Amino acid sequence: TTVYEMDFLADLMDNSELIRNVTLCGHLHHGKTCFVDCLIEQTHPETEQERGVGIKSTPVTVVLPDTKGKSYLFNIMDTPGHVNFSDEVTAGLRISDGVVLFIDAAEGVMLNTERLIKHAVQERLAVTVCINKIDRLILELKLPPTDAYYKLRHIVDEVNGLISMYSTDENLILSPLLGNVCFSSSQYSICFTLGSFAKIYADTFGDINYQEFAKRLWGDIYFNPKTRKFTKKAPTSSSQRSFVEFILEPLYKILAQVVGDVDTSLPRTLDELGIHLTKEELKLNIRPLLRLVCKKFFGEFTGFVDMCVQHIPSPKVGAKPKIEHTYTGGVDSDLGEAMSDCDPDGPLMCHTTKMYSTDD
Amino acid sequence: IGVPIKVLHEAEGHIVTCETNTGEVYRGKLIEAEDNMNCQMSNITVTYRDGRVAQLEQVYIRGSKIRFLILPDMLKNMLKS
Amino acid sequence: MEPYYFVEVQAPADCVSAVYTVLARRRGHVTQDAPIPGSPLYTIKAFIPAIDSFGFETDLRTHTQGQAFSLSVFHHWQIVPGDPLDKSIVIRPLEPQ
Amino acid sequence: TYQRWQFTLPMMSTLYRLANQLLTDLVDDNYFYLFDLKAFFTSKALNMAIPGGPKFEPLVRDWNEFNDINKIIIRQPIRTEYKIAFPYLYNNLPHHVHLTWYHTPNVVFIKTEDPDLPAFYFDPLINPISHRHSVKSQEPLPDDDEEFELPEFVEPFLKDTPLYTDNTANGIALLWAPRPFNLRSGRTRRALDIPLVKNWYREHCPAGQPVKVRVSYQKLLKYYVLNALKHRPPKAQKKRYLFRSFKATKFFQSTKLDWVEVGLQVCRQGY
Amino acid sequence: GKSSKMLQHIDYRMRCILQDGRIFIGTFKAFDKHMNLILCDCDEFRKIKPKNSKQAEREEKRVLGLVLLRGENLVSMTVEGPPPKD
Amino acid sequence: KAHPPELKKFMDKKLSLKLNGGRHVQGILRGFDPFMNLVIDECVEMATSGQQNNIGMVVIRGNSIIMLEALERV
Amino acid sequence: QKEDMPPEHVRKIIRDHGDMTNRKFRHDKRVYLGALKYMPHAVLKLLENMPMPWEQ
RNA sequence: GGUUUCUCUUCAGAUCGCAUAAAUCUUUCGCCUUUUACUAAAGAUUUCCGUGGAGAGGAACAACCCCAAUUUUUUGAGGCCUUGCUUUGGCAAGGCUA
Ligand SMILES: Nc1nc2c(ncn2[C@@H]2O[C@H](COP(=O)(O)OP(=O)(O)OP(=O)(O)O)[C@@H](O)[C@H]2O)c(=O)[nH]1
Ligand SMILES: [Mg+2]
Ligand SMILES: [Mg+2]
């Protein structure tokens, strides 16, 4: 043993305020590599494999559109999650600026997840969460939609308690209202934040203000139909919270229609959502069909890029609270500040952390 | 939304310029833009009806008050039309 | 002084006793065992001398038909229960002390 | 020509339940931990043999310091199962060894008892969430009494549709079922190509059967492995069609007979 | 009724005269709801447009380039050139 | 639909409004409505003769609203 | 095409030839013999379609 | 302008055909007087049972009512005086208005 687009990539590199450097971390088998794979196929329609375990990290840099269309350049450091390989994570954790911690919906937090939130807060990065693998609550565990709410709330509160345990300053508490957490199913092509879901609600239905809407969904707000005005506790209807009735129950019904009643009720329900599908594409099996419908309805990936763009340092802002730790002097006279400029100019101070051997 | 409005919003952050309804020009970096064309620009250069050129910190103008808009050589690259 | 390993074992409800026995053979001291909220699984947290940690994972999985599964991390050192300097201690050279 | 079936989900559910007897009630793959093709390939390569697995003839056929018996600490004896879990760490001269490992996320699918209770239903089997913590938290909660209101067009995205039916619990059970049954459509296979009993002898602890049948288990596993190991791609193709070439001549005719009739014909002609 | 008449002049050369009277010569790569025009490599000519003139044809001309105008001032649209295949 | 001005971060800031007729004024933008009409206190109109004479709070008509440029760093 | 014969055609031919002892045939002797080379095909094709105990 | 079917021609599986048989050669191995028939490992190569791709024909059946004051089909952007300018043409500036 990209013609008119890599130039565009170059100009994006040159802006240095349209790029985000993020590390994709979490526990073992919690969804990272499949996230990345389905994502590169979103962009390109163009030892390990036998192991089923990733050993060494891999970086990807790709151009992603947000919920407004503005393209970004994304630096994604896909790490391994086996607690024995935490070495690789440290590497990414230096040369990146934020962390997307992938948590499992069915398991929650375990060893490596808490240890990685520790390693991430002690290196003063940004911290975002993707509660991934949510179908394991609907199809596998078979949970009433309200107890799905309970479990999601629990995971978020526990990760919140730990991130408070290792960090003194109550600068950030995570909850999807702030745009901290996506909800995901890597393989079933669904990733959404309250922002993205409320914008979907608006774009297909009437003109409702998606931002003020998204401020109302998570977290014990109820809604009374007659007044059409969300309230804190005052339904005695024995009804669900805004979250359940508006985001989960519709998602339960989407899935239950796809896997249960694919032959009879599915064309009707698909009409009621706006998705049209060929005869040929309704002859798929249930997993490819489910993923295809969910992709056709949920759009590509906006929840993630939205949450990240909204809470990434953007290396231009970036560098300054970093060279405290990285640099041995930090800022004294010449180079600390020069780097803090992050200007493509002069000093050229780079940090190399990995060496990927060429096969040959 | 239209293809031009999508290009304009996507041009946010890049270097752009515009020619207003009153005959004045304003270039700058992309600050903010929306589907209503209400354009916010920052650190721009401004050229009046005679040609007086000067600097502006940040400004926000209604959509209908702009006539044309010049973008960099990037946007030309949805090629389906 | 010798290092210790922190072990976290996911397991079905029944096979808890199984892992217990394994940890006994290897000087375990299982600390905690707790339900997983919203799951049919229990989580076990235990310590184990890194000496006896060799093959503990595969031993665990073999005895329980793959159902259980552990990861391990170094946690802290500790006093090994011997007297390092005693000439009155002779070592039978292949059986375990 | 009878390729390509497509079926309804009730069809599949009854078919499943009817074939339930000839089937494995395993749901995932970490049952076969050191009991898959790669574990056997490695064991065969190292000439060590796991408890219930096959045994093969050795692949090919003085002093060292590391085995100086004064310089070891023996707390746990190394045993062949470790030597096959980690081929390279635990073995000198590991050659033609396949490196097997898997911690495949234990799948948690709760078989129901009756079709009565709803599909989505907290099961007694699941551990109660009862998530407790401090005074839990408070939100960036944009309190009402300022304003907000939903234009009386929008609604829960589809509320004319019930959560479940008499077809969803079934439809989910069908999602983790053995290979033919977790499908909806495929090509049709030949009748000899369908082994009915493989999923049986591939199991791990027969636990109290006579030594007779355990030796039979191991020899069936051996045959299985040798099949998988010596697999050659087709590598070549010339495709004489004997019977189309025959039928195209002036000497062969065609018909439909009772099976038994052409059976008696073939035997008479042999004689 | 055919929905084709706009695309027929789409992707081809075009001379646009706004409510301002000037000429913008550019590729009609698309239109929008308001009649907005996003055409690249455009040329802004103000004096006249050259039509086989023995005197000259290049006067009071600048390169506007990617010009994205709002359809509030879209007045007259003609075909000034063919499409260059790049 | 009905997107209001991005004047949240711009609220409570001194800006000059240039609107039709060459109408140049200075005034503090503190709030407005979704039609892009403004409500600016401290309005001191900058007439052509150059004299800036204060008028106070009024309704900054977005109908002919041309542009507003603040005097702070928003 | 070549469409099907009636079954009685086969049945009559084979019951006629019987066991090739009557000299009235005496020429199909040679082909009868020469067809032995292919009888392991007839046997395989026959046994791979046997009628599967839910069928009569 | 499509499916099903039949026939005819032509090109491939690189993890397959979710199944899995025999043969040849070369080298060790075990049966033991000889050879076939065997053992059971490795390697190199073939045959057989199935499949795919492409194309040609031929066949059967589907089928020639309210609407605008920030972006265009309502918009009051109106005039002139003077000045300066430029070769006239024309450009800019202030005012008067009703
Ligand atoms: N049920 C379910 N499983 C998922 C989903 N997304 C990913 N998976 C799992 O993803 C696994 C694929 O490899 P990954 O787990 O993504 O790799 P990883 O998370 O980085 O783990 P390591 O590579 O060892 O660090 C499969 O085993 C699936 O179990 C999902 O949305 N639903
Ligand atoms: Mg991986
Ligand atoms: Mg002789």
mmCIF file of N, CA and C in Angstrom, chain A residues 29 47 51 53 136 138-142 144 147 153-154 157-158 175 177-178 201 204-205 212-213 215-216 218 221 223 227-230 245 252-253 256 259-263 268-269 272-273 282 284-287, chain D residues 8-9 99-101 103 105-110 120-122 126 129 131 133 136 139-144 147-152 154-161 163 165 167-168 171-172 175-176 183-185:
data_model
loop_
_atom_site.group_PDB
_atom_site.id
_atom_site.type_symbol
_atom_site.label_atom_id
_atom_site.label_comp_id
_atom_site.label_asym_id
_atom_site.label_seq_id
_atom_site.Cartn_x
_atom_site.Cartn_y
_atom_site.Cartn_z
ATOM 1 N N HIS A 29 -19.228 6.518 24.810
ATOM 2 C CA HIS A 29 -20.334 6.077 23.969
ATOM 3 C C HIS A 29 -21.539 6.991 24.016
ATOM 4 N N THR A 47 -8.000 -0.001 13.682
ATOM 5 C CA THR A 47 -8.024 -0.071 15.137
ATOM 6 C C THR A 47 -9.361 0.395 15.699
ATOM 7 N N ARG A 51 -12.723 -1.433 16.893
ATOM 8 C CA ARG A 51 -12.810 -1.237 18.328
ATOM 9 C C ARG A 51 -14.186 -0.764 18.751
ATOM 10 N N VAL A 53 -14.616 1.777 19.851
ATOM 11 C CA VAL A 53 -14.197 2.783 20.812
ATOM 12 C C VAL A 53 -13.201 3.681 20.108
ATOM 13 N N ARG A 136 -34.060 7.268 23.523
ATOM 14 C CA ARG A 136 -34.016 6.224 24.530
ATOM 15 C C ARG A 136 -35.002 6.455 25.656
ATOM 16 N N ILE A 138 -38.264 7.558 24.727
ATOM 17 C CA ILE A 138 -39.559 7.372 24.100
ATOM 18 C C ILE A 138 -39.662 5.941 23.622
ATOM 19 N N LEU A 139 -38.746 5.535 22.755
ATOM 20 C CA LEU A 139 -38.860 4.222 22.151
ATOM 21 C C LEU A 139 -38.367 3.139 23.078
ATOM 22 N N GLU A 140 -37.304 3.391 23.813
ATOM 23 C CA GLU A 140 -36.703 2.314 24.576
ATOM 24 C C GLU A 140 -37.285 2.199 25.970
ATOM 25 N N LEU A 141 -37.247 3.283 26.730
ATOM 26 C CA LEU A 141 -37.668 3.244 28.120
ATOM 27 C C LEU A 141 -39.166 3.430 28.265
ATOM 28 N N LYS A 142 -39.815 4.057 27.285
ATOM 29 C CA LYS A 142 -41.266 4.159 27.251
ATOM 30 C C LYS A 142 -41.788 4.896 28.478
ATOM 31 N N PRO A 144 -43.975 8.124 30.211
ATOM 32 C CA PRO A 144 -44.953 9.173 30.034
ATOM 33 C C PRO A 144 -44.257 10.499 29.806
ATOM 34 N N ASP A 147 -42.866 12.382 32.836
ATOM 35 C CA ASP A 147 -41.678 11.831 33.473
ATOM 36 C C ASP A 147 -40.441 11.982 32.605
ATOM 37 N N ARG A 153 -35.117 17.452 33.643
ATOM 38 C CA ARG A 153 -34.885 18.422 34.701
ATOM 39 C C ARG A 153 -33.855 17.907 35.686
ATOM 40 N N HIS A 154 -33.928 16.624 36.024
ATOM 41 C CA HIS A 154 -32.998 16.076 36.998
ATOM 42 C C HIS A 154 -31.571 16.148 36.495
ATOM 43 N N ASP A 157 -30.278 19.643 36.625
ATOM 44 C CA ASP A 157 -30.015 20.176 37.956
ATOM 45 C C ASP A 157 -28.764 19.554 38.564
ATOM 46 N N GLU A 158 -28.522 18.269 38.316
ATOM 47 C CA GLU A 158 -27.338 17.634 38.890
ATOM 48 C C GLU A 158 -26.060 18.166 38.254
ATOM 49 N N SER A 175 -29.509 26.224 32.038
ATOM 50 C CA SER A 175 -30.897 25.884 31.787
ATOM 51 C C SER A 175 -31.190 26.329 30.366
ATOM 52 N N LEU A 177 -33.257 27.985 28.900
ATOM 53 C CA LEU A 177 -33.711 29.349 28.664
ATOM 54 C C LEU A 177 -32.560 30.249 28.274
ATOM 55 N N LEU A 178 -31.393 30.018 28.846
ATOM 56 C CA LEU A 178 -30.232 30.826 28.535
ATOM 57 C C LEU A 178 -29.579 30.401 27.231
ATOM 58 N N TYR A 201 -41.897 26.675 15.452
ATOM 59 C CA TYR A 201 -43.300 26.914 15.749
ATOM 60 C C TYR A 201 -43.788 28.154 15.028
ATOM 61 N N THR A 204 -43.721 27.921 10.873
ATOM 62 C CA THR A 204 -44.735 27.163 10.140
ATOM 63 C C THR A 204 -46.144 27.675 10.421
ATOM 64 N N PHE A 205 -46.385 28.139 11.631
ATOM 65 C CA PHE A 205 -47.664 28.681 12.026
ATOM 66 C C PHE A 205 -47.621 30.194 11.888
ATOM 67 N N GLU A 212 -39.605 35.791 22.599
ATOM 68 C CA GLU A 212 -40.396 35.863 23.817
ATOM 69 C C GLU A 212 -41.085 34.544 24.090
ATOM 70 N N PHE A 213 -41.450 33.830 23.033
ATOM 71 C CA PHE A 213 -41.979 32.488 23.202
ATOM 72 C C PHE A 213 -40.960 31.598 23.895
ATOM 73 N N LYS A 215 -38.673 32.202 25.700
ATOM 74 C CA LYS A 215 -38.455 32.516 27.107
ATOM 75 C C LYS A 215 -39.469 31.859 28.034
ATOM 76 N N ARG A 216 -40.453 31.124 27.518
ATOM 77 C CA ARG A 216 -41.591 30.717 28.324
ATOM 78 C C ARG A 216 -41.764 29.213 28.446
ATOM 79 N N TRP A 218 -39.502 26.176 29.044
ATOM 80 C CA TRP A 218 -38.940 25.282 30.038
ATOM 81 C C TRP A 218 -39.274 25.761 31.439
ATOM 82 N N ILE A 221 -43.671 26.726 33.865
ATOM 83 C CA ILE A 221 -44.701 27.601 33.331
ATOM 84 C C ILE A 221 -45.802 26.739 32.740
ATOM 85 N N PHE A 223 -49.877 26.940 30.863
ATOM 86 C CA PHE A 223 -50.510 27.798 29.880
ATOM 87 C C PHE A 223 -51.988 27.486 29.849
ATOM 88 N N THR A 227 -57.222 32.156 28.077
ATOM 89 C CA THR A 227 -56.561 33.454 28.116
ATOM 90 C C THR A 227 -55.455 33.560 27.074
ATOM 91 N N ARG A 228 -54.975 32.422 26.566
ATOM 92 C CA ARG A 228 -53.818 32.371 25.668
ATOM 93 C C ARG A 228 -52.614 33.084 26.279
ATOM 94 N N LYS A 229 -52.518 33.050 27.604
ATOM 95 C CA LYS A 229 -51.481 33.753 28.342
ATOM 96 C C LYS A 229 -50.843 32.783 29.321
ATOM 97 N N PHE A 230 -49.536 32.575 29.189
ATOM 98 C CA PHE A 230 -48.851 31.625 30.054
ATOM 99 C C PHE A 230 -48.871 32.122 31.488
ATOM 100 N N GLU A 245 -46.568 19.887 27.100
ATOM 101 C CA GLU A 245 -47.626 20.069 26.115
ATOM 102 C C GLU A 245 -47.143 20.702 24.826
ATOM 103 N N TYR A 252 -43.547 13.060 21.183
ATOM 104 C CA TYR A 252 -44.049 11.712 21.372
ATOM 105 C C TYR A 252 -44.975 11.325 20.241
ATOM 106 N N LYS A 253 -45.927 12.193 19.899
ATOM 107 C CA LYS A 253 -46.875 11.822 18.855
ATOM 108 C C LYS A 253 -46.193 11.677 17.506
ATOM 109 N N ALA A 256 -44.518 8.132 17.873
ATOM 110 C CA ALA A 256 -45.534 7.096 17.936
ATOM 111 C C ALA A 256 -46.255 6.924 16.621
ATOM 112 N N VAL A 259 -43.464 4.996 14.187
ATOM 113 C CA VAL A 259 -43.136 3.591 14.427
ATOM 114 C C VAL A 259 -44.375 2.737 14.614
ATOM 115 N N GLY A 260 -45.454 3.288 15.133
ATOM 116 C CA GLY A 260 -46.604 2.459 15.395
ATOM 117 C C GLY A 260 -47.529 2.338 14.210
ATOM 118 N N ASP A 261 -47.926 3.475 13.654
ATOM 119 C CA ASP A 261 -48.986 3.564 12.659
ATOM 120 C C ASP A 261 -48.483 4.059 11.309
ATOM 121 N N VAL A 262 -47.362 3.517 10.838
ATOM 122 C CA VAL A 262 -46.774 3.940 9.567
ATOM 123 C C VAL A 262 -47.701 3.701 8.381
ATOM 124 N N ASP A 263 -48.586 2.713 8.464
ATOM 125 C CA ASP A 263 -49.388 2.371 7.295
ATOM 126 C C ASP A 263 -50.652 3.215 7.184
ATOM 127 N N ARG A 268 -51.647 11.157 6.861
ATOM 128 C CA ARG A 268 -52.421 12.248 7.437
ATOM 129 C C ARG A 268 -51.558 13.121 8.335
ATOM 130 N N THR A 269 -50.930 12.513 9.343
ATOM 131 C CA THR A 269 -50.107 13.280 10.266
ATOM 132 C C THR A 269 -48.978 14.002 9.563
ATOM 133 N N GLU A 272 -50.419 17.145 8.146
ATOM 134 C CA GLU A 272 -50.581 18.143 9.199
ATOM 135 C C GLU A 272 -49.271 18.778 9.652
ATOM 136 N N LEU A 273 -48.123 18.289 9.195
ATOM 137 C CA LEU A 273 -46.852 18.919 9.531
ATOM 138 C C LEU A 273 -46.209 19.645 8.361
ATOM 139 N N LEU A 282 -41.548 6.427 1.493
ATOM 140 C CA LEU A 282 -42.331 5.777 2.528
ATOM 141 C C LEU A 282 -42.247 4.265 2.463
ATOM 142 N N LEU A 284 -39.303 2.896 3.225
ATOM 143 C CA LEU A 284 -38.090 2.676 3.986
ATOM 144 C C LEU A 284 -38.429 1.940 5.270
ATOM 145 N N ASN A 285 -37.421 1.367 5.910
ATOM 146 C CA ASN A 285 -37.680 0.739 7.188
ATOM 147 C C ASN A 285 -37.847 1.795 8.259
ATOM 148 N N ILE A 286 -38.153 1.357 9.474
ATOM 149 C CA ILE A 286 -38.609 2.310 10.476
ATOM 150 C C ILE A 286 -37.489 3.208 10.966
ATOM 151 N N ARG A 287 -36.272 2.703 11.119
ATOM 152 C CA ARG A 287 -35.224 3.624 11.554
ATOM 153 C C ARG A 287 -34.845 4.611 10.460
ATOM 154 N N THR D 8 -47.265 -5.123 6.323
ATOM 155 C CA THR D 8 -47.894 -4.247 7.291
ATOM 156 C C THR D 8 -47.383 -4.580 8.683
ATOM 157 N N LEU D 9 -47.491 -3.640 9.594
ATOM 158 C CA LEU D 9 -46.902 -3.856 10.910
ATOM 159 C C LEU D 9 -47.702 -4.845 11.760
ATOM 160 N N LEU D 99 -8.319 -7.573 17.433
ATOM 161 C CA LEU D 99 -8.419 -6.907 18.724
ATOM 162 C C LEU D 99 -9.884 -6.584 18.969
ATOM 163 N N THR D 100 -10.488 -7.332 19.882
ATOM 164 C CA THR D 100 -11.909 -7.277 20.162
ATOM 165 C C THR D 100 -12.180 -6.477 21.422
ATOM 166 N N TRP D 101 -13.103 -5.528 21.335
ATOM 167 C CA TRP D 101 -13.570 -4.860 22.536
ATOM 168 C C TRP D 101 -14.884 -4.165 22.220
ATOM 169 N N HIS D 103 -18.266 -2.174 24.633
ATOM 170 C CA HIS D 103 -18.982 -1.872 25.860
ATOM 171 C C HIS D 103 -20.338 -1.295 25.534
ATOM 172 N N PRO D 105 -23.874 0.134 24.564
ATOM 173 C CA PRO D 105 -24.692 0.619 25.676
ATOM 174 C C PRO D 105 -25.852 -0.298 25.963
ATOM 175 N N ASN D 106 -25.856 -0.855 27.166
ATOM 176 C CA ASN D 106 -26.896 -1.785 27.555
ATOM 177 C C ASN D 106 -28.253 -1.200 27.236
ATOM 178 N N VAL D 107 -29.005 -1.911 26.417
ATOM 179 C CA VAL D 107 -30.287 -1.424 25.951
ATOM 180 C C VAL D 107 -31.323 -1.831 26.975
ATOM 181 N N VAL D 108 -32.259 -0.937 27.232
ATOM 182 C CA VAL D 108 -33.171 -1.059 28.355
ATOM 183 C C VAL D 108 -34.571 -0.996 27.761
ATOM 184 N N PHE D 109 -35.070 -2.135 27.313
ATOM 185 C CA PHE D 109 -36.361 -2.201 26.660
ATOM 186 C C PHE D 109 -37.252 -3.070 27.522
ATOM 187 N N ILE D 110 -38.375 -2.520 27.953
ATOM 188 C CA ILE D 110 -39.207 -3.155 28.951
ATOM 189 C C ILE D 110 -40.351 -3.880 28.268
ATOM 190 N N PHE D 120 -47.012 4.215 26.451
ATOM 191 C CA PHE D 120 -46.103 4.971 27.300
ATOM 192 C C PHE D 120 -46.649 4.977 28.712
ATOM 193 N N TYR D 121 -45.938 4.313 29.613
ATOM 194 C CA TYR D 121 -46.481 3.991 30.922
ATOM 195 C C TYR D 121 -45.316 3.668 31.839
ATOM 196 N N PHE D 122 -45.223 4.379 32.951
ATOM 197 C CA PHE D 122 -44.123 4.177 33.875
ATOM 198 C C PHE D 122 -44.094 2.740 34.358
ATOM 199 N N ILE D 126 -38.790 0.120 36.143
ATOM 200 C CA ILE D 126 -37.975 1.321 36.265
ATOM 201 C C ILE D 126 -37.944 1.790 37.700
ATOM 202 N N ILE D 129 -37.837 7.956 39.760
ATOM 203 C CA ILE D 129 -36.924 9.081 39.610
ATOM 204 C C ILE D 129 -36.644 9.700 40.967
ATOM 205 N N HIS D 131 -36.018 12.321 42.020
ATOM 206 C CA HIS D 131 -34.855 13.184 41.984
ATOM 207 C C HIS D 131 -34.959 14.205 43.096
ATOM 208 N N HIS D 133 -32.562 17.046 45.598
ATOM 209 C CA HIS D 133 -31.424 17.952 45.538
ATOM 210 C C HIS D 133 -31.703 19.041 46.563
ATOM 211 N N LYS D 136 -34.294 23.480 44.860
ATOM 212 C CA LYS D 136 -33.754 22.992 43.591
ATOM 213 C C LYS D 136 -33.035 24.090 42.818
ATOM 214 N N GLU D 139 -35.234 30.354 38.193
ATOM 215 C CA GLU D 139 -34.919 30.467 36.776
ATOM 216 C C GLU D 139 -34.675 31.921 36.395
ATOM 217 N N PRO D 140 -34.031 32.174 35.267
ATOM 218 C CA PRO D 140 -34.310 33.412 34.535
ATOM 219 C C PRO D 140 -35.711 33.368 33.951
ATOM 220 N N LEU D 141 -36.693 33.263 34.840
ATOM 221 C CA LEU D 141 -38.096 33.063 34.524
ATOM 222 C C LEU D 141 -38.771 34.400 34.261
ATOM 223 N N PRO D 142 -39.123 34.695 33.015
ATOM 224 C CA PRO D 142 -39.763 35.983 32.697
ATOM 225 C C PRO D 142 -41.212 35.978 33.159
ATOM 226 N N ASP D 143 -41.392 36.336 34.430
ATOM 227 C CA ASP D 143 -42.705 36.384 35.060
ATOM 228 C C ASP D 143 -43.725 37.078 34.171
ATOM 229 N N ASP D 144 -44.970 36.614 34.252
ATOM 230 C CA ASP D 144 -46.069 37.263 33.558
ATOM 231 C C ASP D 144 -46.446 38.517 34.334
ATOM 232 N N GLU D 147 -46.754 41.122 30.077
ATOM 233 C CA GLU D 147 -47.590 40.795 28.926
ATOM 234 C C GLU D 147 -47.024 39.541 28.280
ATOM 235 N N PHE D 148 -47.888 38.820 27.564
ATOM 236 C CA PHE D 148 -47.573 37.822 26.542
ATOM 237 C C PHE D 148 -48.862 37.107 26.183
ATOM 238 N N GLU D 149 -48.969 36.678 24.932
ATOM 239 C CA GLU D 149 -50.240 36.108 24.513
ATOM 240 C C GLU D 149 -50.052 35.344 23.213
ATOM 241 N N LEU D 150 -50.765 34.233 23.078
ATOM 242 C CA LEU D 150 -50.629 33.391 21.899
ATOM 243 C C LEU D 150 -51.731 33.701 20.908
ATOM 244 N N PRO D 151 -51.403 34.112 19.689
ATOM 245 C CA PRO D 151 -52.442 34.362 18.681
ATOM 246 C C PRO D 151 -53.289 33.126 18.443
ATOM 247 N N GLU D 152 -54.605 33.231 18.649
ATOM 248 C CA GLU D 152 -55.472 32.052 18.756
ATOM 249 C C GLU D 152 -55.598 31.319 17.416
ATOM 250 N N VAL D 154 -52.285 29.258 16.719
ATOM 251 C CA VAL D 154 -51.301 28.238 17.042
ATOM 252 C C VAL D 154 -51.813 27.397 18.197
ATOM 253 N N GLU D 155 -51.315 26.175 18.294
ATOM 254 C CA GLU D 155 -51.762 25.199 19.271
ATOM 255 C C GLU D 155 -50.638 24.199 19.472
ATOM 256 N N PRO D 156 -50.729 23.347 20.491
ATOM 257 C CA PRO D 156 -49.844 22.186 20.525
ATOM 258 C C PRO D 156 -49.839 21.540 19.160
ATOM 259 N N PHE D 157 -48.638 21.264 18.669
ATOM 260 C CA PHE D 157 -48.415 21.136 17.239
ATOM 261 C C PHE D 157 -49.401 20.197 16.566
ATOM 262 N N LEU D 158 -49.818 19.141 17.246
ATOM 263 C CA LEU D 158 -50.895 18.309 16.733
ATOM 264 C C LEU D 158 -51.636 17.692 17.898
ATOM 265 N N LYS D 159 -52.763 18.291 18.269
ATOM 266 C CA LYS D 159 -53.528 17.823 19.409
ATOM 267 C C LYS D 159 -54.765 17.045 19.020
ATOM 268 N N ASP D 160 -55.102 17.011 17.739
ATOM 269 C CA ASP D 160 -56.142 16.118 17.258
ATOM 270 C C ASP D 160 -55.691 14.665 17.191
ATOM 271 N N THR D 161 -54.436 14.375 17.527
ATOM 272 C CA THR D 161 -53.884 13.038 17.432
ATOM 273 C C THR D 161 -53.628 12.468 18.817
ATOM 274 N N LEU D 163 -51.973 10.075 21.821
ATOM 275 C CA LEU D 163 -50.611 9.608 22.043
ATOM 276 C C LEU D 163 -50.379 8.239 21.450
ATOM 277 N N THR D 165 -52.083 4.054 20.340
ATOM 278 C CA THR D 165 -53.128 3.318 19.676
ATOM 279 C C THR D 165 -52.942 1.858 20.062
ATOM 280 N N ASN D 167 -51.581 -0.134 18.289
ATOM 281 C CA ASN D 167 -50.573 -0.532 17.350
ATOM 282 C C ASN D 167 -49.205 0.020 17.674
ATOM 283 N N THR D 168 -49.079 0.885 18.679
ATOM 284 C CA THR D 168 -47.792 1.503 18.961
ATOM 285 C C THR D 168 -46.951 0.655 19.894
ATOM 286 N N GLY D 171 -45.633 -1.873 17.729
ATOM 287 C CA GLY D 171 -44.702 -1.274 16.805
ATOM 288 C C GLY D 171 -43.365 -0.952 17.417
ATOM 289 N N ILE D 172 -43.338 -0.730 18.720
ATOM 290 C CA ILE D 172 -42.080 -0.508 19.410
ATOM 291 C C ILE D 172 -41.406 -1.817 19.744
ATOM 292 N N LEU D 175 -39.158 -3.076 17.268
ATOM 293 C CA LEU D 175 -37.988 -2.306 16.906
ATOM 294 C C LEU D 175 -36.709 -2.937 17.402
ATOM 295 N N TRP D 176 -36.772 -3.747 18.450
ATOM 296 C CA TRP D 176 -35.629 -4.521 18.914
ATOM 297 C C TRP D 176 -36.086 -5.952 18.912
ATOM 298 N N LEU D 183 -37.620 -5.795 10.542
ATOM 299 C CA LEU D 183 -37.663 -5.162 9.234
ATOM 300 C C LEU D 183 -39.102 -4.893 8.827
ATOM 301 N N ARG D 184 -39.262 -4.346 7.625
ATOM 302 C CA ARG D 184 -40.559 -4.190 6.975
ATOM 303 C C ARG D 184 -40.579 -4.720 5.568
ATOM 304 N N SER D 185 -39.433 -4.937 4.945
ATOM 305 C CA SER D 185 -39.352 -5.206 3.525
ATOM 306 C C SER D 185 -37.929 -5.609 3.218
#
